[PDB]
A paper describes a structure:
Recently, several unexpectedly diverse compounds were reported to deplete cyclin K by linking CDK12–cyclin K to the DDB1–CUL4–RBX1 E3 ligase. Here, to investigate how chemically dissimilar small molecules trigger cyclin K degradation, we evaluated 91 candidate degraders in structural, biophysical and cellular studies and reveal all compounds acquire glue activity via simultaneous CDK12 binding and engagement of DDB1 interfacial residues, in particular Arg928.
First, we explored the CR8 SAR through the gradual simplification of its gluing moiety. While a phenyl ring on a propyl chain (DS11 (3)) supported robust complex formation (EC50 = 57 ± 3 nM), shortening the chain by two alkyl carbons yielded roscovitine, which gave much poorer recruitment (EC50 = 703 ± 144 nM).
Residue numbers in the entry:
A (entry chain C): 20 to 267
B (entry chain B): 715 to 1039
C (entry chain A): 1 to 393, 708 to 1140
Write the structure that this text describes.
């Protein structure tokens, strides 16, 4: 019926990129750069956040079946965003994506697109569709962050602070392989959990079951804290590695 | 696995012939070599390279893998031409969308004039169509192109909805601009003639009602070549758009521009006096000018005309015999 | 685009309706006979009919009735066409000049309505206050006959009874009253209403509803002396009038369905009834007068008079003369005698009017080696079944071969100096357990005879029960000599085996010439036949010998010889068979993308397949591969009645809606899609139902015949006996003739003021389109019959294109020569 789009962290040691001699740090850097390229290009084009995320998910999935050494990331990213636009009904012309990609990339980077940028991108569309197995519909943590937040009742300002901080954590997790490890529903909870810890809020009280300490369970069944912590650990690592700090 | 689409080759199908020409590619009837099942294969050509893969096909792939219903066609898989070995840039082969094969199309059955529909047949037909439409509308998807050609029927009496190349998601909270005219002029709702552009799911209801009347008269209810002429024909039967029946008609861009000859009174019940009472009420509600006052799919399903229809008895339509030959 | 020309070689001959009245003069007795699109006016004499006038109408005549409103000296004529064109007509004569006046006219079609099962019904009030029309289920349309209603404006009255069988205006009522039989789930009923022109609605009718026979078919409005109505069924005849009820159920009428009625005595004492076996009856109203002075109806009696042709309309004229209007056989004048002849019959035939009947199939054959070609047609049905040999010589000479059984398909086998004809006759389950034929016929009067012994389907184990009296078809292959037209041999096919297709040909390396018949096993329980036989027969030395048989899993609807191979269509499948050196058929290749492959035609390695609803398909046999390829299909859905190949690119088809179309290869090789799309480039409303397209011409060819502008020759036969011809034109000749039509239409006055452009518009119930690619030759050939002032008016400002002279003005004498050459193609 439908494909399995989730892997175990241990499995990322065996992506095509890894086996061709790329080390874990480099593939991680390559993923962040490609995701951020997709994010930055589409933000410049005025694209909806779902469109940006869908492209990023295609991108991450793509390099579970292919190597970064044989497929230039920025071409792939541009192709993903191009397709994502058509899937999410926020379409863009390929020439405009190239134009923006040229604006944001230096000369070395734009060399990946080769002599004919549009062609390298449009040609890749075939591989992308076959690679993602024509499973185009994608759900993103954003919708669940809002579906769940709507059921919280309490201080309007404390909840809005929780949401925005968590929303920032969603945007940042797009630079990671979490999109490949955990369903979006879990991600939405994890970022609520993280923001709750950081803002010293006790979300249990805002729920319809103030006494159910495990508030995540009334939204997402069968999630141990083990998972929410692993996700939190992975999100905060990006901030510790980078100069950037937690939004608060 | 069954879920890894886009890799299996079209070699696995013996092509029987061309059933019809689709807008984004032609559709051919074929037999699966392994199972013997008959499937209809839609041709998707990206060789044009104007904008790559057709968005119309993208909509059908995105939506039909989400929609599961007896009255909604099932896309079985996506298969490809023998791809060029290790040279994707040279490769310009096309993709095929596999669908269940359907024996006949409604437009073809009406046009031959051979088919005869009893009340009970229509009940079985309308109940399936509305059940499919309700499923889709509940999933917040709009068909946007309900035509007799897009209604497919098996000789068993099973009905399925087909072309989704123009389908788009509807957001009730957020009104956003769409394509101004989607449904074919003969079955287009008045709001699209007047260019609402922020249309509601009620657009599909209007068409389905046009079909309801068509099953009884064996003739399309409103057929015209110009948008105003259709508005006049609709206006003669359903009444002229006016503020009393359509409070917000004044906000529609073309209300002042497009006017019927007269302010015609509604005559639907009179002109369809031959239609049974249970059905006539269904038509009056489906063919209501104001989209806000037009009945919903669920309301059409919770009907004296359709509620007590049992899908176990699908009433197979009248089959032409050798004597009919 | 494509350019073609269509002309009538023989006008419609079947009688569709007939009425009597005082139409030409308040003094004369007139007989008006209606053939499809044609009206014939006669005057009744003591010897027979005197023809006075014939007009064509741009429409199929659906309603024809004569009435005389107060203030008129003579009867007026109401006609409604099948496309709902209504008009009131008047005869006017000025010395030698006879013309037809259109007094009122209009189109009465409703935007929304369901066409009724029993067809258009039109009746007129005895006081001529209104015309009643039953066009749509659940609606009654009233045209009030006031002096001012020159446009025939009308209103609908809601009718609760949706399924009406028949309706008539009654006599002797205080208000206009309708009496009708209707059907609902509880059976059939007779009911009455009163029509109020003031209120524009029905009021309660004079007498109560009565439950009537399940197969009550016709309503007879009895005149003033009795009043009320008579209802004719399959088993009984009843009289209803308020409290009075009578029913006679004589066993004689149960035998054959009664289809037509007419009034002999104006007072209603005597009525004439006819049935599908041709039997003619007299229905008698036995009066009883009370001392009150009132006249009541005592009893009904039915008396058998004799045999006429199977009749669509009966009309009594005068004295003992009755006109028998026949659609399935030749029409007649017969005299009714008071004394029976020595055989017991009171009916003696006077004159016989040729009706080509239904033309089921036909072939063109040069019997006398004359380079001309004669047309042998399968004509008629049942007792009227006939072979008609037609040659040109200025009238068409027609010879009739009586068969007394239904002819189905015909093919000529020159090697045997004879024709092969498929026929079917009706037998009835008799007390022996077998069947008995109603009358002897060709298949039983053959010199030598044979019955198939094939055991292909003998395993049976499928039960088919028989009830005494049920009808069955018995199918035969007839061998008929080409000079004497004597039935030389008849081969009776298997029980419940229908013969559907027939070819005469050589196959493969076999020097013998065979008759090959494709059959189907027809059981009432089957929706589609699932068994069939392809039988190969050799006619040799007065005996037919079965050479081989092939079992198929369906009906062999159509067969055609294909370059030494046998191309046969079995249900969905189109199959090509090879004839082996062992004298057996072998499947070679198959094509399956058809719902029902009804018709097949070949040119070279190309095949044209005609489907019940999938229009037409162009196949190609690919010899290098040994299989079929789909070249192009016509996607527009049409119901097919006959197809033909005009040339390698143009294909002709006939619709069940009386329409013709021409498809062409789109000839643009840009994309695969364009080629595989057959583009309809010709649309034309013929007005006839075409059964058979046949290449050939009846015109004498001495080799000296001027090469006409027209190229090619396709003859076609129709259900109403009409024979037509289709031919192609050059782009220039078409544009010229088309521009002339538009000029002629402005000049020529139409009966009923019916626009010619509307009449020829393609018309399915669901879609209507303007004609294209076709020249109505019958309009062009009328240029020679319009007066000189009109001829010159037509040619004004008329220019030729792309000729010896690019622009060349036309004169009235130039066009007279052109049309006169166009009349030479038939
Ligand atoms: C006839 C127009 C219709 C429009 O989708 N095409 C069609 N028509 C179908 N019906 C069968 C048919 C065959 C030939 C002519 C018309 C209809 C059909 N069955 C499966 N499919 C797939 C592609 C969803 C079918 N698609």
């Amino acid at each position: 019926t439908k494909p399995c789009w989730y892997w175990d962290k241990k499995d990322l040691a065996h992506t095509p990129s890894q086996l061709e001699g790329l080390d874990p740090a480099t593939e991680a850097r390559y993923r962040r750069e490609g995701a951020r390229f997709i994010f930055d290009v589409g933000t410049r084009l005025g694209l909806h956040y779902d469109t940006l995320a869908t492209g990023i998910i295609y991108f991450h999935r793509f390099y579970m079946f292919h190597s970064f050494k044989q497929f230039p990331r920025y071409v792939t990213g541009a192709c993903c965003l191009f397709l994502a636009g058509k899937v999410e009904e926020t379409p863009k012309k390929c020439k405009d994506i190239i134009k923006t990609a040229r604006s944001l990339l230096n000369d070395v980077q734009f060399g990946q697109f080769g002599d004919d940028p549009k062609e390298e991108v449009m040609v890749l569309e075939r591989i992308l569709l076959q690679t993602i197995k024509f499973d185009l519909q994608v759900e993103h943590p954003y919708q669940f962050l809002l579906k769940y937040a709507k059921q919280l009742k309490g201080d309007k300002n404390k909840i809005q602070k929780l949401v925005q901080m968590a929303w920032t954590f969603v945007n940042d997790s797009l630079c990671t392989t979490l999109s490949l490890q955990w369903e979006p529903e879990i991600i939405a909870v994890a970022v609520m959990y993280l923001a709750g810890r950081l803002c010293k809020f006790e979300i249990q009280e805002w729920t319809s079951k103030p006494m159910y300490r495990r508030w995540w369970e009334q939204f997402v069944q069968d999630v141990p804290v083990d998972v929410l912590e692993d996700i939190c650990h992975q999100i905060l690592d990006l901030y510790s590695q980078g100069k950037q700090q937690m939004p608060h | 696995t069954e879920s890894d689409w886009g890799k299996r080759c079209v070699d696995k199908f013996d092509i029987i012939g061309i059933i019809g020409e689709g807008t984004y590619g032609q559709v051919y009837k074929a037999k699966d070599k392994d199972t013997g099942e008959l499937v209809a294969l839609k041709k998707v050509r990206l060789d044009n390279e104007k904008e790559g893969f057709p968005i119309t096909a993208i909509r059908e792939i995105k939506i039909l893998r989400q929609l599961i219903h007896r009255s909604v066609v099932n896309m079985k898989e996506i298969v490809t031409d023998k791809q060029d070995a290790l040279d994707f840039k040279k490769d310009k082969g096309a993709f095929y969308l596999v669908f269940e094969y359907m024996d006949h199309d409604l437009m073809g059955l009406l046009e031959s004039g051979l088919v005869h529909f009893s009340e009970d047949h229509i009940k079985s037909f309308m109940k399936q169509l509305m059940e499919g439409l309700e499923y889709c509308h509940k999933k917040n998807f709009l068909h946007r192109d309900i035509k007799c050609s897009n209604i497919l029927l098996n000789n068993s009496g099973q009905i399925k909805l087909a072309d989704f190349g123009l389908a788009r998601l509807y957001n009730s909270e957020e009104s956003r601009p769409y394509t101004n005219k989607v449904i074919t002029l003969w079955y287009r709702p008045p709001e699209l003639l007047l260019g609402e552009e922020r249309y509601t799911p009620a657009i599909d209801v209007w068409s389905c009602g046009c079909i309801l009347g068509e099953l009884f008269t064996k003739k399309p209810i409103f057929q015209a070549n110009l948008e105003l002429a259709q508005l006049e024909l609709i206006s003669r039967l359903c009444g002229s758009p006016c503020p009393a029946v359509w409070p917000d008609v004044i906000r529609l861009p073309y209300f002042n521009t497009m006017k019927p000859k007269k302010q015609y009174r509604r005559r639907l019940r009179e002109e369809f006096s031959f239609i049974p009472s249970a059905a006539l009420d269904l038509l009056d509600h489906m063919l209501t000018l104001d989209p806000s006052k037009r009945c919903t799919a669920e309301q059409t399903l919770q009907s004296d005309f359709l509620k007590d229809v049992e899908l176990s008895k699908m009433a197979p339509p009248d089959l032409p015999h050798w004597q009919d030959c | 685009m494509s350019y073609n020309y269509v002309v009538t070689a023989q006008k419609p001959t079947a009688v569709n309706g007939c009425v009597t009245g005082h139409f030409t003069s308040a003094e004369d007795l007139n007989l008006l006979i209606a053939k499809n699109t044609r009206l014939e006016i006669y005057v009744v004499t003591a010897e027979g009919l005197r023809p006075v006038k014939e007009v064509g109408m741009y429409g199929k005549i659906a309603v024809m009735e004569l009435f005389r409103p107060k203030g008129e000296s003579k009867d007026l004529l109401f006609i409604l066409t099948a496309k709902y064109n209504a008009c009131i007509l008047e005869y006017k004569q000025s010395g030698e000049s006879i013309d037809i006046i259109t007094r009122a006219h209009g189109n009465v079609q409703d935007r929304i309505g369901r066409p009724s099962e029993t067809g258009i019904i039109g009746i007129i009030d005895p006081e001529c206050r209104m015309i009643g029309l039953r066009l749509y289920d659940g609606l009654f349309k009233v045209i009030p006959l006031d002096r001012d209603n020159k446009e025939l404006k009308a209103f609908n009255i809601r009718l609760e009874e949706l399924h009406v069988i028949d309706v008539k205006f009654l006599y002797g009522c205080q208000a206009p009253t309708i009496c009708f039989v209707y059907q609902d789930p509880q059976g059939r009923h007779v009911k009455t209403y009163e029509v109020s022109l003031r209120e524009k609605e029905f009021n309660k009718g004079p007498w109560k509803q009565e439950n009537v026979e399940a197969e009550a078919s016709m309503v007879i409005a009895v005149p003033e002396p009795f009043g009320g109505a008579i209802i004719i069924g399959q088993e009984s005849i009843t009289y209803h009038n308020g409290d009075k009820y009578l029913a006679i159920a004589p066993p004689i009428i149960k035998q054959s369905t009664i289809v037509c009625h007419n009034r002999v005595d104006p007072n209603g004492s005597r009525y004439l009834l006819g049935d599908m076996e041709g039997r003619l009856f007299m229905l008698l109203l036995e009066k009883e007068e009370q001392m009150d002075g009132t006249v009541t109806l005592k009893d009904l009696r039915v008396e058998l008079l004799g045999e006429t042709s199977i009749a669509e309309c009966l009309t009594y004229l005068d004295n003992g003369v009755v006109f028998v209007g026949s659609r399935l056989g030749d029409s007649q004048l017969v005299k009714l005698n008071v004394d029976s002849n020595e055989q017991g019959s009171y009916v003696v035939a006077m004159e016989t009017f040729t009706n080509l009947g239904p033309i089921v199939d036909m072939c063109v054959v040069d019997l006398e080696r004359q380079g001309q070609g004669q047309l042998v047609t399968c004509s008629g049905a049942f007792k009227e079944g006939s072979l008609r040999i037609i040659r040109n010589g200025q009238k068409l000479h027609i010879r009739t071969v009586p068969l007394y059984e239904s002819p189905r398909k015909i093919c000529y086998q020159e090697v045997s100096q004879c024709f092969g004809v498929l026929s079917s006759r009706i037998e009835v389950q008799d007390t022996s357990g077998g069947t008995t034929a109603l009358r002897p016929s060709a298949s039983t009067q053959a010199l030598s005879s044979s019955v198939s012994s094939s055991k292909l389907f003998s395993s049976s184990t499928a039960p088919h029960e028989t009830s005494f009296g049920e009808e069955v078809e018995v199918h035969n292959l007839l061998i008929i000599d080409q000079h004497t037209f004597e039935v030389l041999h008849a081969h009776q096919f298997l029980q419940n085996e229908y013969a559907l297709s027939l070819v005469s040909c050589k196959l493969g390396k076999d020097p013998n010439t065979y008759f090959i018949v494709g059959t189907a096993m027809v059981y009432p329980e089957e929706a589609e036949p699932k068994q069939g036989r392809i039988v190969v027969f050799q006619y040799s030395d007065g005996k037919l010998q079965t050479v081989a048989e092939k079992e198929v899993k369906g009906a062999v609807y159509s067969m055609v010889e294909f370059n030494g191979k046998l191309l046969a269509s079995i249900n969905s499948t189109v199959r090509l068979y090879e004839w082996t050196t062992e004298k057996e058929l072998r499947t070679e290749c198959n094509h399956y993308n058809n719902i029902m492959a009804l018709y097949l035609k070949t040119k070279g390695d190309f095949i044209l397949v005609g489907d019940l609803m999938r229009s037409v398909l162009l196949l190609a046999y690919k010899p290098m591969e040994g299989n079929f390829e789909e070249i192009a299909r016509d996607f527009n859905p049409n119901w097919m009645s006959a197809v033909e190949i005009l040339d390698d690119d143009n294909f002709l088809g006939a619709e069940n809606a009386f329409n013709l179309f021409v498809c062409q290869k789109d000839s643009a090789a840009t994309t695969d899609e364009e080629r595989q799309h057959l583009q309809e480039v010709g649309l034309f409303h013929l007005g006839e139902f075409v059964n058979v397209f046949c290449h050939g011409s009846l015109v004498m060819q001495n080799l000296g015949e001027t090469s006409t502008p027209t190229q090619g020759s396709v003859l076609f036969g129709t259900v109403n006996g009409m024979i037509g011809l289709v031919t192609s034109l050059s782009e220039s000749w078409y544009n010229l003739l088309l521009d002339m039509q538009n000029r002629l239409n402005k000049v020529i006055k139409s009966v009923g003021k019916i626009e010619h452009s509307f009449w020829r518009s393609f018309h399915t119930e669901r879609k209507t389109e303007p004609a294209t690619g076709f020249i109505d030759g019958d309009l062009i050939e009328s240029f020679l019959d319009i007066s000189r002032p009109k001829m010159q008016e037509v040619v004004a400002n008329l220019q030729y294109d792309d000729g010896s002279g690019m622009k060349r003005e036309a004169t009235a004498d130039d066009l007279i020569k052109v049309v006169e050459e166009l009349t030479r193609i038939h």
